[PDB]
Amino acid sequence: GRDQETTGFAWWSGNARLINLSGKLLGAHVAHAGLIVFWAGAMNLFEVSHFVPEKPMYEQGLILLPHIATLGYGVGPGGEIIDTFPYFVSGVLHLISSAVLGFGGVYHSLIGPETLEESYPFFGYVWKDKNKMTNILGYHLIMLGLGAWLLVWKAMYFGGVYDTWAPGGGDVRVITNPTTNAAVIFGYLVKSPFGGDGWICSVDNMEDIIGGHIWIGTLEILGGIWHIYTTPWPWARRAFVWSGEAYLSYSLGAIGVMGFIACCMSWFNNTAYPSEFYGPTGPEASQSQAFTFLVRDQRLGANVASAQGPTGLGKYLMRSPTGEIIFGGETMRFWDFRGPWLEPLRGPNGLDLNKLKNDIQPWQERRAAEYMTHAPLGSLNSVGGVATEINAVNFVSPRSWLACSHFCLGFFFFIGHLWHAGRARAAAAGFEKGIDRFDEPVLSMRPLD
Amino acid sequence: ENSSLWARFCEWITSTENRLYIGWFGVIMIPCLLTATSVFIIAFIAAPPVDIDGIREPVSGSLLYGNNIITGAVIPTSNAIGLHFYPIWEAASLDEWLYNGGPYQLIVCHFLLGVYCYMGREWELSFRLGMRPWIAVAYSAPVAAASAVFLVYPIGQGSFSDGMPLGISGTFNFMIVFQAEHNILMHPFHMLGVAGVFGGSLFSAMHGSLVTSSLIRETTENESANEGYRFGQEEETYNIVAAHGYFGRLIFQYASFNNSRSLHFFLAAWPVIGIWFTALGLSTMAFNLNGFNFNQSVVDSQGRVLNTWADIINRANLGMEVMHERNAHNFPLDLA
C-alpha cells in the first residue's frame, strides 16, 4: 500500500500512484485481465445455464453465446442450436484461466517487486525510453497478429465459421477462398461511412472478413517486428508526448473509436453479427415489416405493384432515389439493407417483382415475420415494443444492448482521452499543478489580446 | 531570414497575440463554422420548402416562405436519402439539393466538425497559456449532446430526417415525437440530465448568491458594488469563511464546502456529469433502448388493470405517435 503525502495522489486517484512502479503496474493489469476473462467465463456459464432451446438465442438476452455461435460451435443449418456443450467448454476454460491470471495479478500487486527495473532488466521499462516502449508495442502486435490468425485458421481449417449467406441457408462454412485482394480489403477502409457505404460495417460476406484478417494478421506480425527493431523517428519525437499517461491517452482515443465502430457494427451488420443469433438489425426488422404485409395483402387479392399509397408514392413497392425497386413506406430510408432472406428476391434492378409475385418462399416469410416481432426496440426494463406498448413480452434485442453499451463505453473513453491527453501534455510541460504565481505567462503578454 | 515560410505560419497560427486565438484546431474550426454559419443564415431566410418526410410534401421553414423566428427552421434532410451522403455535387441541380433537405446535411456536417474542433482549441489555448487543460472536458458535455441530436440519433434511426431541426419550433417537434417513440421522461439518464440542469441552476444561484452576499465593503451606496473589485487585484474580494459559515447554519455545517477549490470542482461536475448522461440517454434511445415502460404494471386480483400515472403518460404518448408523420406510415409499427 501507499498513502497521499508520499505520492501527492488521494485515495480516489490512487492507481496513479503506480505509474512509475513497474511491478505493481504489471499486477494491476494481470489482475484486471483476470476480470475480463472471469466475466467472460462467468457470463458465459450464466448464459449456458439460462439457455432454453424452445426460444431463439437473441430472445433470451444472450450476447456472448452469439459470438461462439458465429464461430460455428454447436449450431446447425438455419441457426438451429445442436448442442450447448461447446458453449460450456468456452465458459470453463475462461473461468479456470481467470484464477491463473488472478493469481499472478494478486502476486505482482502484493509480493512481487515494486519496480522490476534493476532485477529483471528484460521486463523493466521507463516510460521515456522510446526503444523499450516500441519493444513492448511490438511484442503485443505479434500477439494480436497471431490472435488474428486464430480466426483465419478456425475459418479455413478448424471446422469453419457460420456463414449466414451460404447457399442452402446459413450454416457453418469452411472459408476455402478468403479474399486477399488489396483493392477489396483496403477498399472498405477508404470507403465513406455514410448511407450505401457504411465504412467497414457493410462487409457483406465472410470471405472478405476472413481474408481481411489475413491482412490484419500479417501486418501486425510485420508491424510488431518493425517496432522491435526500430525506435520512433525524429518526426515522431517531435509530435508525441512520451509519458505513461500519454501512452494511455493514445490508447484511450484509439479504443474509444473502436467502441463507436463496434456500436455501429452490431447495429447494422448482419454478416459478422448473424441475425439468427443476434436478431434482426434496425434496418432488417423495418424491411421485414414491409415484406410481411406485401405477402399478407397479396394473398388477399391485391396487386402489390399497382397499389398506390395515401401519399402517392406506392404502398408496397416504390423506387429508390438511385432507381432501385424497393419497399415503400417509412422504410424507404433502409432501402440499402441487404439480408440473406431478402436477397434471393432481388434482381439487378432492385427487387424483382416477377420473382416476388411467384417465388416468395415459405421459409422467407417464416423468417421475416420472426424479425418483425423481434424489432430492436424495447424498454430499459426489457418490455419490447414502442414506448406506447403494454407489458406483454420480455425482449430487448442484443443488438440494442450491444450498441447502447458500446456507444456509452465509446463515449466515456473518448472523454478519458480528452482527460489524459490534456493532462499528460500539460504534466510534461510542467503546469499541471497550476499557474506558477511568479511567472504567470499571461502577465508577460500584450493586453487587448 | 533563417525562419522558413511554414515556420512563420506556425508562429502565427499558434500565436497567443491574435485577438481570437486560432490554433491548429482553428484552421478546421473557422472555415467549418463559417461555412455552416453562412449556409444557416441563407437557408433560415431564403430556402425553398423541403420534403423532410420523403413523401413528396414540402415543409416550409424560411422567413421568405411565411415563417417567423419561432416557427422558422432549417428543415432536416429527406427521408428518401436517409443516411446517404448528399452534398451539392451529388445533386443534378441546385434546386434538387434544396428540395431534398441538402442544406441541413451541409450545416450539420460542418457544425459537428466545428464544435469538435472548438473543443480542441479550448484545450489548445489552455496549453498555450500554461493552464490546466480540462475546460475542454467540461465543454464535451454540450458537444456530446449536440452530437447525439444531429449525428447519433439519425444513425440509430437510419435517416437524417430524424435529426433535430435547426429551429425553435422544429426543436419542439423533435422533442414531442421523441417522447412518444422513446419515452424520454421515464428514462433515468434524462432524469439525471434534468437533475444536472436543475441542480446546475440551483448551484449557480447558490454559489452566485453566497459570493455576492459576502462582498467586502469597498464602495459607497452611490456606486455599484461591482466597482469594489479591480481586474488583476491579488487580494480576494469576498469572505469564503462567512459564506461557508452561513450555508453551514442554513442546512448542516459539514454539508457545506469549506474548500473553494473543492466547491468549484463540484460546481463543474454536477452539470457536466448530468449532461453526459442525458447525451448518452439520447444515444441509447437512438438504438431504441427507450425509457421505462410501466404500462399495465399495477394489476389487482381477477387480473384487471389498475391505471397509474404512467398509463396516463401513455395516453399522452400514444396520442402523439398516432399523429406524428401522419402520412408516412403505411404499416402499423413505427420501426423507423
Binding site: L448 | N67, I69, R230, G232
Partner: peptide
C-alpha cells in the same frame, strides 16, 4: 414585410455581437 423586420432584428443582434467582441471595453490590469 415582416420577414424584413425579422432579418433586421437578426442582423441587429449579430451587430451587437460583432461590437461586443472587437470593440469591447478592454480590461485594464493592476
Amino acid at each position: 414585410m415582416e420577414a424584413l423586420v425579422y432579418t433586421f432584428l437578426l442582423v441587429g443582434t449579430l451587430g451587437i455581437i460583432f461590437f461586443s467582441i472587437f470593440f469591447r471595453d478592454p480590461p485594464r490590469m493592476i
